[PDB]
Amino acid sequence: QVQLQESGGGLVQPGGSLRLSCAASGSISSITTMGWYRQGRELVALINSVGDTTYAGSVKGRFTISRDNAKNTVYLEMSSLKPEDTAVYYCNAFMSTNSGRTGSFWGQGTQVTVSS
């Protein structure tokens, strides 16, 4: 019972910056983490329900992950972009219940291209 709406992204020059957004709706209370992954589908940045943040070594100091809890939206503030940052970036929300049931939800994938 989580829906994710991705937005943002596009084309930037090397050293450029972009914001990705991933809006969540539905069973928010059960989400333990949300994050962006690129593609192996590898972790870029994650934020958990208490706001702890985790960054891939390749992106730390350049990318910031944040949330606006007033809108259940998580943001990936990409900066100092490199051509190797070029990829489809997917938003994930991972859900865990009291029951022990779990769920994993993925957005449709947002293209980021860093070039010329």
Structural resolution in Å: 2.0
Spatial contact of 89 and 22, defined as CB atoms under 8 Å apart: no
Q: Give the contacts of 46 (CB within 8 A, at least 6 positions apart).
A: 33, 34, 35, 36, 53, 54, 65
Name the DSSP class of 28: G
- The label of the residue with tokens 């934020």 reads 47
Q: Could you state, in order of their start, the residue ranges of all structural domains in the chain?
A: 1-116
Q: Where are the alpha helices (DSSP H) in the chain?
A: none
- Strand ranges of the sheet holding 18-26, from the earlier edge strand across to the other edge: 2-8, 18-26, 73-78, 64-68
Distance CA 15, CA 67 (A): 24
Q: So what's the architecture of 1-116 in CATH?
A: Sandwich (2.60)
Inter-CA distances, 41 with 26, 44, 56, 90, 98, Å: 25, 10, 12, 9, 28
